[PDB]
Amino acid sequence: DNQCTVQVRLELGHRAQLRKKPTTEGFTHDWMVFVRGPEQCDIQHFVEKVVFWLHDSFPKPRRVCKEPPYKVEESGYAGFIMPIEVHFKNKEEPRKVCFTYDLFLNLEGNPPVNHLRCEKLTFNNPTTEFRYKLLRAGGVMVMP
Ligand SMILES: C[C@H]1CCCN1Cc1nc2ccc(NC(=O)c3ccc4c(cnn4C4CC4)c3)cc2[nH]1
């Protein structure tokens, strides 16, 4: 009778391409990973920050974006599994969500990578304050 759910959508994705020639350091690939909303949505209303956990080999592997764009642009030798934490402007649980992102590169001779992973987040009975943020972001209220 006082229940609701608010669904919001996140898009995680990455692009990778084999450099025409490797960098001095022998980096073979450029890549970019991101978190975004669908078009006409503003996820910054409910996202405090996004944390991208790069392979321990990278300088400052804990890459924090506190405002859009939520992305990391890098060059590298190899794909890896990237924890991505999306922190919410929520005073209560859940305070964040963690994704395990498959940052895979294109093997020599394959076209560039351009992947998207769509994530629907369902908040059950958010606080008044957090519900407001989710809706401002373009979130959809479902009643029972
Ligand atoms: C454009 C600039 C901005 C700041 C730094 N950046 C250049 C840059 N510095 C870098 C420093 C390190 C790396 N490391 C990798 O690309 C990498 C290394 C080892 C990996 C994997 C996957 N698995 N494994 C282990 C062996 C099994 C990936 C890439 C770097 N790119």
Residue numbers in the entry: 2 to 145
Which sentences did the original study use to describe this structure?
In addition to the well‐studied binders of acyl lysine, so‐called bromodomains, YEATS (YAF9, ENL, AF9, TAF14, SAS5) domain containing proteins bind acetyl and crotonyl marks on histone tails. There are four YD‐containing genes in humans (MLLT1, YEATS2, MLLT3, and YEATS4). We have reported the discovery of the first small‐molecule inhibitors and a cell‐potent, selective chemical probe for MLLT1 and MLLT3 YDs.
YDs demonstrate higher affinities for crotonylated lysine peptides over acetylated ones, which is thought to be related to the presence of a π‐π‐π network between the crotonyl double bond and residues F28, Y78, and F59 in MLLT1.7 Docking studies revealed a potential interaction when compound 1 bound to MLLT1 YD between the amide bond CO and backbone NH of Y78, in addition to the amide N‐H interacting with the side chain of S58. Although the Kac/Kcr channel in MLLT1 is linear and narrow, both ends contain adequate space for ligand elaboration.
